[PDB]
Design a protein around this ligand. Structure first.
Ligand code: EIC
Lengths: 48, 49
């Protein structure tokens, strides 16, 4: 029921154990050196 | 001595080890240690450094 303004899809491949690191306030190898989400992140993270 | 231990203890006899006088540079675990679960309760992870 919503319309989205600036839709950006960031795609990558990580380990199964590093999926939890894709979050606004996580630490770790991926979260620190590879891909960091903003604290005020508005969106959805999908992993399969 | 903690995450690379050859033998771990049973859950009913869980081992407790004191950590003192050291620098908790956990980034050294990035090379070889992959953790399925890492949940911090009383502190935000990003402030751990
Ligand atoms: C030898 C134990 C020293 C403990 C010192 C006390 C607090 C320091 C905190 C956290 C260290 C463990 C981090 C494990 C997860 C790394 C990041 C990840 O992979 O997601």
């Amino acid at each position: 029921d919503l319309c989205f303004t600036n839709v950006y899809a960031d795609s990558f491949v990580i380990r199964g154990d590093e999926v939890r690191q894709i979050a606004p306030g996580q630490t770790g190898k991926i979260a620190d050196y590879n891909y960091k989400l903003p604290d005020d992140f508005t969106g959805c993270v999908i992993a399969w | 001595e903690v995450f690379n231990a050859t033998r771990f203890a049973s859950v009913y006899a869980w081992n407790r080890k004191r950590i003192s006088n050291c620098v908790a540079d956990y980034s050294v675990l990035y090379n070889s240690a992959s953790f399925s679960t890492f949940k911090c309760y009383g502190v935000s992870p990003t402030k751990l450094n």
